[PDB]
Structures are given as structure tokens and as C-alpha cells.
Amino acid sequence: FWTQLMLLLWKNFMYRRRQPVQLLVELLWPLFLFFILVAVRHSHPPLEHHECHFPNKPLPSAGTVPWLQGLICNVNNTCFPQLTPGEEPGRLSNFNDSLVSRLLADARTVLGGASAHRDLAQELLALRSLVELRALLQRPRGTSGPLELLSEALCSPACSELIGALDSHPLSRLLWRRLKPLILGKLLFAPDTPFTRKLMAQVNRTFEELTLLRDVREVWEMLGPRIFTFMNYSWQDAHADVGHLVGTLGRVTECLSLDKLEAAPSEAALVSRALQLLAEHRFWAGVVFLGPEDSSDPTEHPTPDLGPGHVRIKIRMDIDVVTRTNKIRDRFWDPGPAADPLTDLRYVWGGFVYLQDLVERAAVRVLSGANPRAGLYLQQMPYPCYVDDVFLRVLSRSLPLFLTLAWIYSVTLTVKAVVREKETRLRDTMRAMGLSRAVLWLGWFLSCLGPFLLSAALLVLVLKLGDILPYSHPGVVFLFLAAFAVATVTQSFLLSAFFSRANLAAACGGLAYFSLYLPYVLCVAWRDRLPAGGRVAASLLSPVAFGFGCESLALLEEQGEGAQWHNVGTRPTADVFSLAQVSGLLLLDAALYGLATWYLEAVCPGQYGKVLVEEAPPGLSPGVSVRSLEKRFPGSPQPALRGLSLDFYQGHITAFLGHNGAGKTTTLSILSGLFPPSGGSAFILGHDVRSSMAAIRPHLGVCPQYNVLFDMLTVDEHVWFYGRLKGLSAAVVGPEQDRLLQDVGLVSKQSVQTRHLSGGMQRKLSVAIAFVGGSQVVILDEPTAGVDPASRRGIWELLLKYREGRTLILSTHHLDEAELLGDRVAVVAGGRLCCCGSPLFLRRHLGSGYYLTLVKAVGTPQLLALVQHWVPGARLVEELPHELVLVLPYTGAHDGSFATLFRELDTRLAELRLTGYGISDTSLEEIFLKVVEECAADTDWALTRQQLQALLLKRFLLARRSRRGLFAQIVLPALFVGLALVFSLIVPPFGHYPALRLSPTMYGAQVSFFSEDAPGDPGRARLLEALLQEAGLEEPPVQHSSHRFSAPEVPAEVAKVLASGNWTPESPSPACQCSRPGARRLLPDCPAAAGGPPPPQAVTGSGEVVQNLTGRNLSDFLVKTYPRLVRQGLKTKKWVNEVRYGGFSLGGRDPGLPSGQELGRSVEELWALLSPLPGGALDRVLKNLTAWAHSLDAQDSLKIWFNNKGWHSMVAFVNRASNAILRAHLPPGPARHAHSITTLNHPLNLTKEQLSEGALMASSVDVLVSICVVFAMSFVPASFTLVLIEERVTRAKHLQLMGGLSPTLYWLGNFLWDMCNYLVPACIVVLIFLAFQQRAYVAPANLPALLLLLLLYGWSITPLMYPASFFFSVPSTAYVVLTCINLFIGINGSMATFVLELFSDQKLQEVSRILKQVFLIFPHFCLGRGLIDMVRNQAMADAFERLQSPLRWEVVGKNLLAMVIQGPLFLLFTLLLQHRSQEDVARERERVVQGATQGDVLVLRNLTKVYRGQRMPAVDRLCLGIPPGECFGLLGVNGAGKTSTFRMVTGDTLASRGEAVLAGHSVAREPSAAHLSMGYCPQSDAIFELLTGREHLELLARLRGVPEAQVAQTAGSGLARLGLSWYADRPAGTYSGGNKRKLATALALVGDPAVVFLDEPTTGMDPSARRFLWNSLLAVVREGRSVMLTSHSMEECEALCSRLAIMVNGRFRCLGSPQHLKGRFAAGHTLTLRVPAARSQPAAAFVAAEFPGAELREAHGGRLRFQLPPGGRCALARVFGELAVHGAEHGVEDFSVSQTMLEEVFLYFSKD
């Protein structure tokens, strides 16, 4: 058991040792992909980012100075790792050290002190703020722009000049980019009803209040000169500085739109005016005050409540500035704060929130009827520290793909090797020698699995070294890769168990290896949709399981601890498989694959997809015995093998004799261990083979018919393997090897150590191998099945050298080989034992005896009396004239009695007029036919015009016969797209911008804040209560108090930690969380169970959670608690639903001075004094100053926290806050439900310049239809090339070439035909498009472009694939391959270009236009993308002007021109490819050389052919002279060179040396003239299957030139000459064997060629048809036309052909007429002697002495034949008595004489 496994492993390794290239490829190819992956990883390393806090952004409702401070200071949005002052619950303003704030505070306290007084100089002098202001005023420029000075202070042609000055600094250029649209904008409102007029007046009041500096200016200019004239460092500097500041402020006010507010009557006019302003770049925003009572709201409810009181608003702006409003959350989650002002924070610089706040404030002021106050601020939540790395998701989604791409190659090699050893049956013989399937399959396991576990280790090493998977231990990953390798090996064997062909299985198994990877890709995208349980079901496929384990590997890799011994059995997340449980599924799937193979091998088993007896030897010992053995196949009800009672004896070479199909191979195989005997017994050597099992194998050796040799194994290795397996010991295998080696004499050939280098001789080695075990019994099967006659001598000699002591049973089909070797013969026919006996005993048991024929140049009774005188018995069977056959009596035949007859005949020969007597022995050929037949009975330009017409006719008749094939290949693709048009009538979603109802409820269930700070005010209570009302909570405020505690319990384990620390809520309460430790990386931050430890009170309303976080550290709480909400949804990482989005905090501390009443009192006192103006401008200014002083208090404020990862979070909560304020200021009752505000978002239409880019988004569904059109139209040309491939595979194409047809005209006819075929689908497609009214297609300008595209695409694509006919030798496979190639090129190119154009965010990828201009050199890409450009061009024109043409040569014109250029060159290429190629014997040999005979039709002259690599000519130095009026004959054994001679003479194959002339026409000089008068009929039956034979005949006649009227009669005569009457109307495909041959012969005969060539005309043909062939050829030769014919039927040549030539090794031997040959050498008699002594000297000595001629013919130990001088003058009677005496003189049992037999001519054939 172990030795068999060792031998199998040694063989499997010996295969691989020989090839040093496939091993290198399989070792290096998998590593290249991972080196590429290592390079990619080295390209993009991860980046680490720390914590950062964001500053505060104030809204205009809070104020104007802080709002400007936020506009300029907070542009950069720089992170601050430390806490910012704005986040503290008390502080609401960040800038405390700002110069402006210091100036304001100092001024307020100075006026307060002055009002208290009425010392002032002392208070004012000690002020740093005044000194700083003076220094800032005294600045000699030094700044790029005034914005720099403004920043330093805080933290019209003149206007254009100021902008140009600002252009100097790019950083300030961004500031002006943010400022210019709002400064110079044109606000608009489509409704102009008086209510909207009131609203816009309220809004305009803000800008009117902003326009109050000019009044202070003019009071300055009218009070300046008064003081200047009154009084005339302090004075001179002060006056100049005040004047300069006033002038600068006035210059700033010069660039003011002032009345930016404008109105429009309608929405359409609104859009038009906005577009015009955008063209002028003067547009900022547009507003629409749509009324709910109008109810004209697209895709939204008309109104929530009936009647007025509800305000619905739409703010439309430029698309480039407002965020796209199609989707809510990003499609790929990112590990970042999502806070970059340029890319994601668009509303801050866009201005949407500013205008929303202004409009909401105006609306609440109008509706409520009161004056609310609420300073709104915007604050960004802080974010933990993280690491940005895109590479880990790349591994999560891409690692399985690279592994499968690396391991496809080994699966291909394994499947090809298994199917190779399966197809050639080299494995099937190993079962007979004893080896069982288990050993072979275990050898396959342990041998194929080798390279997999040598590549897995290298991959693991590369993974660890290349930093792709660091911080992990290689053992755990190896224990997974090895499981995958086992699973894929079993899968490869399962695939190998499907097919029975080598190349097909090798190419197809690699397809099913990849096709099972698709479900993983299809299910990873639908991660949430699939249930948990179905994942295990989908994990049955091995790559799916590998991917599902690889996601867990990557997920554990993120957390800093890769696959390691600590966490092998731990699930990283609730619904991801642990790395351990994946291996179990992989091994279970491998076992399932093994069981599937085990079952599948059982579906088709077994199939390799008269009582006259003599039993009496001198020693009776039945070493082998078969008794009543019978076997029945289920397919045939009659048994395959019937009763076989034949016995065997040791030492006798018993031979089976029977025709093919008699059950000989089955009977031989039953005795061996390959099939079960159905019944009876098969006792061998005394113990049955089934029972004896391996005990009988060492004494039995079997060699079957098919050759059993392993190609790569050397000469000696075969004997080594085949001796070791039988159980032979190690020391003597050397000797048995040497014995068989010299017995065949291959010692020197053992040095080269090759097995596939030597050919033909291998059968000798295969026969010898059967004797390696010294077996007592040997069962050979056809030892001479397919070897040449030159080598059968060695097989005969060895099989007779091993004849003594070893029973040998062989099976031969030839009748000759049943007498030379067989000691007994058993006749089998139809699976039954017809006859048995011995060769000598069989011959004697006939009714007739010994034949003596008497020819005539007197009277039978005189001869009868003379014969009766010498021998009494005389049977007279034949008495016809000219021959007198006498039957000598075998019963009582005597050597002397027959002798005396010839003695008297010679003396009386003259007067008897016999002139020769013929003695004939009873031949064994006819008795075999006699008994079997008896046994069977017992059981029972003018030429061109006719030339083009025929080619079209042949193709036309092809379509008529096959209409189902034409319909599917042509009509079905056209109807494929047609049904799609109706099914694709759904609305196309492409990216259009709908209107989104911006509200907080759209996001969904969430957690919200209602923290309160400084609640000591009755007014704040109303707002706090109102905030809860909108959230859906219980209306009464005391409900929370009624609920009392509404919080979860504190965890017990955290209580000890809290007690350990101080846990003051304000100061840092909890402990720090985990972070990046330097050597490790973490994506999130993992805290303890104590982050803001006590669960804050939570109340649930209507799908919402509200949390009371008052007096608690908010920043630390948010930072600590953030990752816990996210980690629930990090499993899929596609659409992450955060839980907290936004929250409110009611600030109560005011930044400015709380007491502004004293400032107002001081202002009023100043107004009363100082002579107030009667006009009242100064009084107006001071009244507004007092109003500002009252507004300085800012009694209540509010702050809003928002999460930036939610795009529309800001606006929704601003809307919620404004609605809450409106509810709060409205008194309680039903009025609260009546009043509400709704806000929306809808971007404007695309501008023309923006249309030029957005048209790309407009393509939409067009891509889907274009792909279907390309797919449908990519079918037909493969069907076009199908028929051409079929014609080229058969020789019928060469028949057409040999005819009058020229290949170029044939190609042209094919081109016209298949264009005529292709034209119909184009029209069908056009009418289908026109029927359903596609706007892009039905346009009068577009239609000609589409028609030209379709017609030209058909016209040029066809010549691409005609050259592919030569490459592919099979029709069906080429069809699929070329269709897939067309689909590949077209779809891939079109999709790649279309995607590249869409996503041209970076202009570097836009340069692909030159790549497309390269792609115009390819013809199939032109059709695909060309249709895409057609639809868009009309789409733009439908909106560019209504709200140029495809015929012009830029959209599809380039494609058309280039592809028409491509058209003819491929036809030229294939046409060039078609023409790419550029003593009797001695007397006749000299005659041709000396002179040429004009009568000779065919004259060969020194013809020679040399195949490459053979080094010996197939035909060498061949020359012949053939007279015209006779019929020739050529003879030779298979392999002599007949077919090569016919091909060079005919012209199919090039001639290496020499030329032939036909009818005075040289082949090289003018082949076409020679082609006219020749008719060729090879062995191959070159006909068109689909057409009927008659159509073939009319077609060839039309090529021949028969007049059209007589064509039918010519066809009738041509068919009637060779039957075919019943098969005339039947297609050539459905013909029997002989019918095709006779049809081909008739086709060669039709047209009456001058010379007709026939290669093997008769091969298994009925005698009647061959007789018709005789008659036809006799008539032809009567007419005077030469017929060259070659066949192996020797009786045919003698009867008809005038001359016969026999050829060996390409050289003639006789070259004479049959009658000359029959007399020159084939005359005389040959004595046949049987000698058991095996001594040549005793037999040769007496024959040579008695007869002068001592030539030896057919010398063998079994039987010896002799040659003696022919035509002996002495009587033949001399030998008979001489034989009688010399049988005693020298050892000879019996003899026979061969004198002028019918077989004498046959014996002549064999020897020469």
C-alpha cells in the first residue's frame, strides 16, 4: 500500500522535474500581483490627525459688528486642539482681546462715568485702546488691501479700483470672492402681493438701518468748520485724522448697491432676469413667497391647514454655490470632521443660512405682532482623534480578487493534467494491475496540493513584510490560506470530473473557478438586505467564504490587534463571522466537493466514453479455463457475449479469429480485472481472479490494444515502474530490465532516455512490458493492431521466443495471422463460438479436396481414365470449356498416388494438348468465409457573369433549406432591442434637482439637546417650553416634573471609579480614552465605561429622544460619547446613520455691558442740549442710537450645535429654532396650530455655459439603450464566418478553387451575399425605432446619420473576421469567441470613454480625447459611442434655443470617414492571405529523360517531396510517361506516398523539386489552363452537407458551362450513371457511407475532364456501386479519356487497368503491364515446409542439392517457404517422391505446394 503511493508520488514529481519553465511561471506569476499591491501600499500611507475644536459663527440676528467679525475672522476654520472660549456654557463670544471690543467697553464706561459726573481727562488718558486706535489711524498704507486693515482692526470705477487692489493678495481675493456677490447682489421676490411687500419692507429695514453712517458724516461736516473757526499735537492731528476717517468711510459707502431689493411679476421673468444678471455676474439670490392657498406645489402636499397663516418660502440660488440637493448622506463614510469650508461647508459662504434667518425673522415679526429678540449662533461639535486611511477598505473589498487571479493558473494546470490522464486511459489500465481508485485519488491529493502550500507561505511572508497586514501573527493567516487551498483543490477535482476532453475541460474549468466569485461582489453591496442566516448559505462557495473571513480579518486589523492568538475565537462585531468559524465552513465545503466528485464518478461507469471441438494435446493441463462465461450490456437486450466453453492448454499460443465486432476485446477484458463477469466461471491457474485478488497478479501480465506509455518518463523508468508495481524486489529489477532491454535490443537507445522521440517502435516495448513479471499466463490484445508490415517481424519473433512454458492468448483480425502463430483457432462471429480446431485439422475437413485444374490451348474421359489410373478417387466439379478442374481425394490422399499422375502427364502433354497443368491447394481464406456464412445462416466577362451567379445561388439555397437557423441568427437580435424600448418607458432618474422640504424630521429618529443656562427669567421659560412642543413631547411643561426622574440607572462598576475621582461636573469628570500609542494605529477612540458616566435623563415622544444635559461639561461629554453611537453602523460603512445631529443650548450671559440704560439717558441729555436741529436729522440719529442702546442688552440668546456629516442639518435646526420662537411669542390656544412657517430648497435652472457641462448628466437612460443596440448588432458577422469556416474545414473549398472559380471572385461573392444578408436587420432596427417615436431618432436631420452609421458599420466589420476562418478549425467555438470579443471591445470602450468624460473633475483625465482619436482606428468602437453623441446633441438643441446636427461631419462624421477607410483594407489583407503561399523501371526512366512524348497526357519529371523534419523524402525521383487512351493504376502500402503524389500532381501541396505537365500545360507557368481539363476525386468526400447532391451537380455544371436548357437532363444522366435516384432529393448531410463517395466521384466525372484522378474510390462500398464504377470508367476509357485510379483492391486492377506501378519508400519497383508481371517473375512454384526442429541447415541443405535454386522467401520458425527455378522442364512429379523420402531424411512433418495459384499474384504483391 505504501509502495504504490511512493511510486505514484515519484511519477507525479518526475513530470514536474522535466519542465523548468512552467514551474518558474507558476512560482513567479502569483507574486507579481502582490508586488504590485505592495507598491500601491507604498504609494498611499495612512495619515494621523489629532483632536480639534472649531470656533463660533454668529448669525446676523445677533448683531452686526460680531457678524462682520465672524465673516472675516472665521474664514479659515482652523482646528484648535485646546478648548475654545465659545464652548464654555457662560461665554458666548470668542474675541475678548480684540481692539474693537476694548474700544466699545472703554467708550461705554467713559460715557457711564461722564453721565455720573454730570476727572474725565484722567479717565480717558489712561487708555491703551485710544493709543492703539491712533496708531492704526496713522498708518502709511503697508497693506495689500483695505481688507487686511479691517482684519487687523478686528482680529463705480473707484469700487473696481478697490477690487483690483484687493486682487494683489490671493488670500484676500478669497475674502472678496465671498463678499462681492452679497455686496453687489440683486435680491428678488416673484410674488408681488402686498403681504410679500410688507415682508420685504421688513427685510429692507435691516439695510435701511445699515445706511445711517451718512447722517453722522454730514453732521461731522457741518460741525467741523464751526469749531475750526471758533478756536483758530492734539488739535492738528485730531482734525486731520477725523477728516481722513470720515472720507475713508464715505469712500467705502460709495460702492453700495443700496436698493439691491427688486421685484419681478412672475417666476419665468424671475428666472430670465436672474439668468441675465448671472451673465452680468450681478446676481446673489432669489426668493419665492409661494402661497399654500395656491396649492400649485410639485411633488409635495398642497397645504397642511386650510386658510392663511402659513408661509411657504423657496430660496433659489446658483447651483455652483448651493449644495446639491438630491441625496442626504454621503455614499462612502469617511473618518473626518467633514468640515472644510471650500468643499463641504457651502451654506456659510453661500449665504443660504443668512437669508433664511432674515426671512424667518421678518415672517415672525409680521405674523406675531411683537418684537422678539434672540441672538442665534452656530457652533461645530468637536471630534475625536483619528487616522485617515483608504487602504483598509480596499483590502476589505479587494483582497479575494487578487488571490483568485493569482490561483487561477494552478487550477488550470491541475484540471488539464487530470483530464489528460483521464482521456488517454493510462489511468484506466492501472486498475487492472491492482491499484484501486483510493490510492490514485490520494496521490492526486498529495501531489496537486504541493505547489499551493508552497505559494501560500510566500504570500503570507509578502503580506507581513510589505506592511499590508502588520501587527498580526502569520500562523493564524496560514491556517486560513491552507484551508482555502484545500477547498480550491477539491473544487478543481470536482470540475475535472465533469468533462471528457482535455483542451475543452482545461479552458472551461478556469471559467467556473472565477464564476463563483461573483456572488460575493453581488452580496457585499446588498450587505444589509441579506439576512444573517442566508450568509452561511451563500458561504458554501469557497471564494465567498474566503471573502467573508477576509472582511473580519480587515475589521480586526483596524482595531490595532490583527489576527492573533488572543482573539482567534472572538467575534469583532455582533454579525461578523469569527476567523475560526470560517475555516470550519471551508473544510466542510471541501468535504462536500469530495463527496460530489465521489457521486459524480458513478453516473457513467463501465463505458469508455458448431460443437466441433478438438481437445487433445500430448500434455493435458488446462492452465487457463473459461466455462460458460456470459455478459450482457443493458443497452442491447441480446447479450454481447454468449456461451464460451473453449478450453486452453499451457504452451499453446491460442489465437482468436474473427471480424471486428465479435466481442473479442470484451472477452479478453473479462478475464482481466476490469469488468465483472455476469455469469459462469473464469478459473485461471486454479483460483478465480475475483477470489484470488492480488495473489494471481504476480503470475499474470496483460497488454491491451491501445498503447500504454507515459510520455515524459525515460526508457528505463517505464520498466522500473512496471516491475516495482508487480511486487518485484529491488535487487532483481535491474536484471529483468536488462533481459527485456536486450531481447528488444534497445540498450544504446536507453542512453538518450526519451519516450516520445521514437515513433512506431514503441509498440514493441509495450508488448515486451507484458512479460516483466515472468507471468505464467499472458492475455495480449492485437499485438499487430496498427504497426507497419516492416516491423511485424520483430513482434512475431519475440512472441515466438516467449512461446514455451508461458500460455499466451492473443486476438487478431487478419486471417493470415491465424496460421503462422496460432496452434488452435476459435472462430468467433457475432459474439459466439462458431467453430474451433487446429490449422491442419481445419483444412482437411472440407467436402472438396485438392484442386487440379487443367487448361487447354484430347477429351475429358481420357484424362479422367488417366487420373483414375494413378489415383482412384477423382471428383470432377468443373467441366466448363478451356478449364478442367480436378478435385484430388483428400480422404485417402497419398503423396505417391498424386506423384505418378504428373509423371505420365509430362510425357503425354503434347498430344493431350493440355500445354500446362494447374495444381491448387485448398486455401484457408474461403473456408473461414464459408463456415461463418454457414454459421450465420444457422443462427438466422461572359464567363464571369455565369460565375458570380452560381455563388449567389449556392448561398441562397443554403438559406432556403435552413430557415430556423437564419431566423435566430438574424431576426432575434433585432427583436431583442425592440421589446426593451417598451419595457424601458419608466421615468429616468439621472440627477435632476427636486425641491426638498428642509425640516428636522426628514433625518429620522435621533437624540436632541435642550440644555438650559441661566434660566432666571420668565421670558426664557416660554421659549424653553415651546422648544419641547414642536418635538412631539407632552404639551404641559410640568410633565417632566410629573415624570420626575426620567434617567437610566448608573452602572455599578463605574460608581467605584467615580468615587475614586472627584467627579465635579464642570471640571473634567471622566478618565481619558484610548489613543494612538505611536507604534500602533486606531481609527476610532475606545473609552472606558465612564464617559459622562451618569445616563442623562431621556424621554421618548414620537420617535425621538430628548436629553437634559444642563450644567454639564458638553464638550467632554460629546467627545467621549461620540464613537459609541457610530460603532453600531461601522460594520457596513456605506450609509452610516449617526444618532445625534443637532441640539439647542439656551445661553443667558451677555457679552456687552448689561446696563445700556445710562448710555441712552446720556444720549437723550446730549440731544436735549447742544441746540437740537429743527430739521431733526440729528434727533433722528440720536433716537436710533437710543434704540441701539436698548438693543445692546440682548436679554435672551440661543446657541445651536450641528453635526457637519449631515449636510442639511444646519438649515433644518435653524428652521426649527425660528418656528419655536414664533410659537413662543404667540399666545396659547388654537392660534398656535394655525400659524406655521415652512421653508424649502430648489436650485435654479442650468445656465447655457453650465448647460454645456450639465448635458453630460442629461444622458440618463440613453446609455442603457445604446448598450442593447451594440449587443444585438454584435452577433451577425460570426454567423457570416460560420459557413466559411465549415467550407474551409472540408476540402470543398479546394474543390471550388480547382474548378473554374478563382479565390478573389469567391471572396467578392461572399462579400456581396453577406451584405445582402446584413441589410435587412438594419432596416428592421430603423423601423422599430421609428415606430415608437424616439425623439432623438425620428428627427429628419438625425435619421440619415443613423442609417449611414448602421449601413457602414455592417459594411466594414465583415472583412475583419474572414481572416479568422483560417485560425479557427471549429465553427461553433469561433462563433462564441468572436461574439464575446466584439462585446468586450465595444462595451468596454464605450463605457470607459463615457465614464471618463463624466468624472473629469481633474483636467488631466480630459485629455483622453486624443485617446479617442486613437480609438477611431478601431471600427467597432465607432458605432457604440457614436450613438451616445447623437442623442445628447438633439437634447441640447431641444433646450438651448427652444427654452447642431448629426449629419454634419464632427459628431459621427469622423467615425464614418475613418471606418470607411478601414473597410477595404481588411478585405485586401484577407485576399493577400489567401495568396500568401508562393529493368522495366529503368527503361521508362531513361525514355522520358531522353525525349518527351506528345501523346503522354501527364509527364512527371524528377518529382520529389520533402516534409520538414522527416529527413527522408515521401516520394523521391519520380517520373512517368502515361499514354492517353489507357487506364493507369498505382499501388503501395499505407505510408508509401500515394496521397503526397496525388496532392502534388493535383496541386493542393507545393512541390519541393520537379514539375508536372498536363495536356501541354505547365503547372507553374499557367495553373488555370491545367485546372480546366482535370477532375479530382480524393478519399475525402468534399461536399456541402446542407445542399442535396443534385444541386451540387447543377452548380458544378453551371461552373462547367453546360447550356441552361440541358442542365436538368445532364443532372439526370449524371445521377443515373451512379444510381442516386432515391437520394437525389436528399441533402448530402443525410447520406450513407458509400453514397457520399459515389456522389463525389460523379462530381469529379461531371463536365467530362480530359483526365480523372481517383484516390481510393472504393472503401467499404457495395459491390453493385463498384460495378457501376467499373462500367463508367470502362466507358470513359472507351471514349479516350485517361483515368488514374489508386486502390488496395488487387482484383480490381488486374481486370481493368492497362498498366500497374507499385511503389515503396516513394520509388517504383516494377513499372510494367499486369500480364508482363504475371510472367516475368510471378510464374513457377514454391515449396512450403513445416519444421519443428527450428534448424535451418537440415531443411536448406537438401532443397539446395535437389533443386538448383536455393532462394529463401518468408523464413520463419512456424513455417518455411522456398524459391526454386521457374518453368522446370522436368515433370512436377519429381518433388512429391523426393518430399516423401526427404521427410524421413530430415525432420519435416508435412508440406504443401504452391504452383500457379490465384494467390501467386497476391504473393507477388507482398514481397515487392
Ligand SMILES: *[C@@H]1O[C@H](CO)[C@@H](O[C@@H]2O[C@H](CO)[C@@H](O[C@@H]3O[C@H](CO)[C@@H](O)[C@H](O[C@@H]4O[C@H](CO)[C@@H](O)[C@H](O)[C@@H]4O)[C@@H]3O)[C@H](O)[C@H]2NC(C)=O)[C@H](O)[C@H]1NC(C)=O
Ligand atoms: C470639560 O472637559 C474638557 C475635556 O478636554 C476639559 O478640557 C481641559 O481643559 C484644560 C484647560 O482648562 C486642559 O487640561 C489639560 O490636562 C492635561 C492632563 O493630561 C494637561 O497635560 C494639560 O497641560 C498641557 O496640555 C497640553 C495639551 O494637552 C500639552 O501640550 C502641555 O504640554 C501641557 O501638558 C492641560 O492642563 C485641557 O485643555 C483639557 N483637558 C483636560 C481633560 O484637562 C475642560 O476643563 C472641562 N471643562 C472645564 C471648562 O473645566
Ligand SMILES: *[C@@H]1O[C@H](CO)[C@@H](O[C@@H]2O[C@H](CO)[C@@H](O[C@@H]3O[C@H](CO)[C@@H](O)[C@H](O)[C@@H]3O)[C@H](O)[C@H]2NC(C)=O)[C@H](O)[C@H]1NC(C)=O
Ligand atoms: C432638567 O434638569 C434640571 C436640573 O437642574 C431641572 O431643573 C431642576 O428641577 C428641579 C425639579 O425637578 C428643581 O430643583 C429645585 O432646586 C432648588 C434649589 O436650587 C430646591 O430648593 C427645590 O426644592 C427644587 O429641588 C429646579 O427646577 C431645578 N433645580 C436646579 C436648579 O438644579 C429641570 O427641571 C430639568 N428639565 C425639566 C423640564 O424637568
Ligand SMILES: *[C@@H]1O[C@H](CO)[C@@H](O[C@@H]2O[C@H](CO)[C@@H](O[C@@H]3O[C@H](CO)[C@@H](O)[C@H](O)[C@@H]3O)[C@H](O)[C@H]2NC(C)=O)[C@H](O)[C@H]1NC(C)=O
Ligand atoms: C426650468 O426648468 C423647469 C423644469 O421643470 C422648466 O419647467 C417645465 O417647463 C416645461 C416647458 O418646457 C413645462 O412643461 C409643462 O408641464 C405641465 C405639468 O407640470 C404640463 O401640464 C404642460 O403641458 C407642460 O408640458 C413646465 O413649465 C415645466 N414642466 C414640468 C413642471 O415638468 C422650466 O420651463 C425651465 N425654465 C427655463 C426658462 O429654463
Ligand SMILES: Nc1ncnc2c1ncn2[C@@H]1O[C@H](COP(=O)(O)OP(=O)(O)OP(O)(O)=S)[C@@H](O)[C@H]1O
Ligand atoms: N462500450 C461497450 N463495451 C463493450 N461492449 C459494448 C459497449 N457498448 C455496447 N456494447 C455491446 O457489445 C456488442 C457489440 O460488440 P462489442 O462487444 O462492442 O465488440 P468489441 O469487443 O469491441 O469488438 P473488437 O472487434 O474485439 S474491437 C453489443 O452487444 C453491444 O451492445
Ligand SMILES: Nc1ncnc2c1ncn2[C@@H]1O[C@H](COP(=O)(O)OP(=O)(O)OP(O)(O)=S)[C@@H](O)[C@H]1O
Ligand atoms: N499527417 C500526415 N499527413 C500526410 N502525410 C504524412 C502525415 N504524417 C506523416 N506523413 C508522411 O506521409 C507519408 C505517409 O503517408 P502517404 O503515403 O503520403 O499517404 P497515405 O498514408 O497513403 O494517405 P491516406 O491513404 O490518406 S491515410 C510518409 O512520408 C509520412 O512520413
Ligand SMILES: *[C@@H]1O[C@H](CO)[C@@H](O)[C@H](O)[C@H]1NC(C)=O
Ligand atoms: C471678557 O471676559 C468675558 C469672557 O466671555 C466676557 O463676558 C466679557 O464681556 C469680556 N470683557 C470685555 C468686555 O472685553
Ligand SMILES: *[C@@H]1O[C@H](CO)[C@@H](O)[C@H](O)[C@H]1NC(C)=O
Ligand atoms: C429699500 O431700501 C432702499 C434703501 O436701501 C430704498 O431706496 C427703497 O425704496 C426700499 N424699498 C422698499 C420696497 O422699501
Ligand SMILES: *[C@@H]1O[C@H](CO)[C@@H](O)[C@H](O)[C@H]1NC(C)=O
Ligand atoms: C430708527 O430710524 C427710523 C428711520 O429710518 C425711524 O422710523 C425709527 O423710529 C427709528 N427707531 C428708533 C426707535 O430709534
